[PDB]
């Protein structure tokens, strides 16, 4: 595991990049190393045969919503785990790395959608949304809303708005 933690830049939440780690004898030797599926008692001796590795940048207070079977703005519209989760959810803070003078605007999180998300599903499409009757052929600002909002991530806030990197490995068989 050398490619998915020391990466210079991470993706947003409205999208996210994962991988298909395989054929490597995962040195799980490798801060909230919270693991759900199988505890690290025997994580160094297994026969999993297939592993994924996602990547996400989110506010600290919203990290709890990553865990399966919970509701939230980013867990009900951006990324939701199934009820039978088998993996681990690692996460630390990036207070002095992702934060930037006057803040960073590159990160985003979807705010509106038609319906909830199914597990392990993403949708990247910036279009006007929302209505009763939707005669919104043009682009306007009443009930026709830009779906994404950018985090603040100012150079210095108190804990709770600072950026946390969270990686959610999804084991398999």
């Amino acid at each position, epitope marked *: 595991f050398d490619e998915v933690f020391n990466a210079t830049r991470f993706a947003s939440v409205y999208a996210w990049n994962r991988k298909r780690i395989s054929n490597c004898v995962a040195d799980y030797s490798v801060f909230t190393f919270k693991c759900y599926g199988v505890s690290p008692t025997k994580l160094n001796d297994l026969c999993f045969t297939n592993v994924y590795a996602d990547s996400f940048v989110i506010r600290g207070d919203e990290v709890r919503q990553i865990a399966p079977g919970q509701t939230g*703005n980013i867990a009900d519209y951006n990324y939701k785990l199934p009820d039978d989760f088998t993996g681990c959810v690692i996460a630390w803070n990036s207070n002095k790395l992702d934060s930037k003078v006057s803040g960073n605007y590159n990160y985003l999180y979807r705010l*509106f959608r038609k319906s909830n998300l199914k597990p392990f599903e993403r949708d990247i499409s910036t279009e006007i949304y*929302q*209505a*009763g*009757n939707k*005669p919104c052929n043009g682009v306007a*600002g*009443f009930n026709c*809303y830009f779906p994404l909002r950018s985090y603040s991530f100012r150079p210095t806030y108190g804990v709770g708005h600072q950026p946390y990197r969270v990686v959610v490995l999804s084991f398999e068989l």
Partner: antibody, heavy 120, light 107 residues
């Protein structure tokens, strides 16, 4: 199902006033709440509006530099801040939002608050 | 920017009659973004029409609304004594937002 607004306030010229429009269900639900002023016997006059979701806001050019509409998700509160009070502002202030619970929204503005009287 | 004019200024008709009101604009306004309000002395405004053609829930059918382009109108078929009030026309399609002047109906 209704809007709650603070009681009357008293201010002298040059100060600033904060008015709270507190609703229920605003969080997690799109809701475009506007702000309208009305003096005694005069026509209604528009002030501002804000989207509870994204923070998007727009102010009248005249009332620019004098109006600040601020949002609070946790408490489901909306703040209307006015600075440098002038006698012409002495009027009743209403906050109106459309019926919005099921993601979608009633396009028209239907709910209206009880109003607040501000005099200076 | 958009200027709305409401006429007639005052009306004086007995209960049961038919009254008509005109709301005129200065630029094209989408017919899906116009509304009317009713105001009685001291109370909060009430929503009557949304979209210029859809009556709000529960309001009497005697109300009616049509129009397009830069001129919209409201018509009330059978008036009653409690309807004596002042009605404001609001176009709510294009920022900046705007209201009307007002009207009065009595006998």
């Amino acid at each position: 199902m209704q809007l709650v607004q603070s009681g009357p306030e008293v201010k002298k010229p040059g100060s600033s006033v904060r008015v709270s429009c507190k609703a229920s269900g605003f969080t997690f639900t799109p809701s475009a709440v506007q702000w309208v002023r009305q003096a005694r016997g005069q026509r209604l006059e528009w002030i501002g509006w804000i989207v509870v979701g994204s923070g998007n806001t727009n102010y009248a050019q005249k009332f620019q530099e004098r109006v600040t509409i601020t949002r609070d998700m946790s408490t489901g509160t909306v703040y209307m801040d006015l600075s440098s009070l002038r006698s012409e502002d002495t009027a009743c202030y209403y906050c109106a939002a459309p019926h919005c619970n099921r993601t979608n929204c009633y396009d028209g503005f239907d709910l209206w608050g009880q109003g607040t009287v501000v005099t200076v | 920017e958009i200027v709305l004019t409401q006429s007639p200024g005052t009306l004086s008709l007995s209960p049961g009659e038919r009254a008509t009101l005109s709301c005129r604009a200065s630029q094209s306004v989408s017919s899906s973004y116009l509304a009317w309000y009713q105001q009685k002395p001291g109370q909060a405004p009430r929503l009557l029409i949304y979209g210029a053609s859809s009556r709000a829930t529960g309001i009497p059918d005697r109300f009616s609304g049509t129009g397009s382009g830069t001129d919209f109108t409201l018509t009330i078929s059978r008036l009653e004594p409690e309807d004596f009030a002042v009605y404001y026309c609001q176009q709510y399609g294009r920022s900046p937002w705007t209201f009307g002047q007002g009207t009065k109906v009595e006998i």
